[PDB]
C-alpha cells in the first residue's frame, strides 16, 4: 500500500490579516483511505472541510481535500495538520499558517539607565531601524543592542536600544519597525518626558 501527498498550496502559508485562504491537498492512495481529517491544536478542526475523489470511478486512486480558512486573526493561526490513512499506511502533512501582521510597536520608552528602548512584535521577524529628525526623519542612528525575546500574541518579538545621551535634541527619535508586510513608526520626544 501507499499514500503520496501533494500540497497544491504552500505548506508555509503567509496569509494577510482578516483574509480568506484555502489549504488544498491532492493525494493519491491505495487502497482507499478510510480515515481523513484536519487537526488543529491537537483537536479536529472546528469548522468544515471539503473532501472528494478526483474521479468517481474504480480505477481512481486520486483524491482531494480542501480546508477553507476565513479571516485569519492572530488568534486562529498555527499548524493545520491534514491526516490521511488506509489499512496499509498512515500519512500526514502540516500547514504552518502565519497571519502576516506588520510589526506593532509594543513599547517605546526610556529606560532607567537613560537608554531609549523599542520593543516591537510581528511576523515575519521585524527589523528595527532607528532614525532621527533634524518633519521627516532621515538621520540614521546606530543601535547599541538588538535581541529577540521569547514570546508568550502569535508572532515574534524584537527589542532594540540606542544611546540617548548622544542627542543634543531638541528633537524627536524615530523607531521604525518593519517586515515584508508593513511598517510601523513610533516617535519619542525628549522635550515632553
Amino acid at each position: 500500500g501507499f499514500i503520496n501527498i501533494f500540497p497544491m498550496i504552500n505548506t508555509t502559508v503567509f496569509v494577510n490579516d482578516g483574509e480568506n485562504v484555502d489549504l488544498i491537498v491532492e493525494y493519491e492512495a491505495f487502497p482507499k483511505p478510510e480515515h481523513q481529517q484536519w487537526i488543529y491544536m491537537n483537536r479536529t478542526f472546528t469548522d468544515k472541510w471539503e473532501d472528494y475523489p478526483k474521479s468517481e470511478n474504480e480505477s481512481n486512486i486520486r483524491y482531494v481535500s480542501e480546508l477553507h480558512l476565513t479571516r485569519l486573526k492572530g488568534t486562529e493561526g498555527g499548524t493545520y495538520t491534514f491526516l490521511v490513512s488506509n489499512s496499509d499506511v498512515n500519512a500526514a502533512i502540516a500547514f504552518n499558517v502565519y497571519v502576516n501582521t506588520k510589526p506593532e510597536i509594543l513599547t517605546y520608552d526610556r529606560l532607567v539607565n537613560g537608554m531609549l528602548q523599542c520593543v516591537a512584535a510581528g511576523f515575519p521577524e521585524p527589523t528595527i531601524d532607528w532614525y532621527f529628525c533634524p518633519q521627516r526623519c532621515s538621520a540614521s542612528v546606530l543601535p547599541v543592542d538588538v535581541q529577540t525575546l521569547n514570546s508568550s500574541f502569535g508572532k515574534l518579538v524584537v527589542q532594540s536600544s540606542i544611546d540617548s545621551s548622544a542627542f543634543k535634541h531638541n528633537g524627536t527619535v524615530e523607531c521604525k519597525a518593519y517586515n515584508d508586510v508593513g511598517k510601523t513608526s513610533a516617535y519619542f520626544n525628549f522635550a515632553f518626558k
Partner: antibody
Amino acid sequence: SEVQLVESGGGLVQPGGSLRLSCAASGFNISVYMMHWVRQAPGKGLEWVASIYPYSGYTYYADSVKGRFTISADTSKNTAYLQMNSLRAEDTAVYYCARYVYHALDYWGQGTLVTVSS
Amino acid sequence: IQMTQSPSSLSASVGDRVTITCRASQRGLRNVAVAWYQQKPGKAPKLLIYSASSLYSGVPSRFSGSRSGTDFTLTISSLQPEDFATYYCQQWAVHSLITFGQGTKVEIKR
C-alpha cells in the same frame, strides 16, 4: 503593501500568431492562492480560460484553448503567465487575471486587451 | 455544460427589490458551489457572494444569495445608485470546474 493584480502583454496580432500575457501580483503571494485567467469577449459575458496552483505547478484549462494556451507561474516574482499560441479571431477579448479562493474569484486585475485579426 | 442565467435585462428603482436566478444543468456534478459577481462598464468584476449565500467582506448586507433543489438566487433589497450594473453567476464543480452565467443587466425604470 495592498492587494493588486496588474495584467500586461496584450496587443494586436495575426491569426495563428502568438502572444504572452503576464499578471503581476502584490499584497499577497501566489504560492498560497490559485491563480486564474478569465477572458471577456466584447459585448459578451465572462469565459473562464485557465487556472494554476503556482506552488505545485498543477494546471487546468478550458476545452477550447488546450494545446494552444499554456498557463504558468513564477512564485519568485509573484507573477502569473498565459502563453497563447495558435491564436484565432474568437480569442479577441479582454483578459483578466484573478485570485481564487473558496471556489470563487475574490480579486480581479483590470485586464489587458487582446485582439486577433488580419 | 452549461448554466442558464435568467432573466437577461431588468429595470428597478431605489428602495426596490431585485430577484435574479441561475440554474445548473444538471446532475452528475459533485460539490457544486455558486458565486455572484457585479460588473460596471469599463471595470473589472467584483465578487459579491461566494458559496451560494456567504457574503464577501465589503459588499453591503443588502446583497443576498440562496439556493434550492432547482434554483440559485441572488436578491437585493432596497436598491442604491451604486447597485446598478451587470450581474454574473459562476459555478464550480469537481467535474468541469468553472462555468459562467450570461450576465444580467439591472437598469432603471422611469
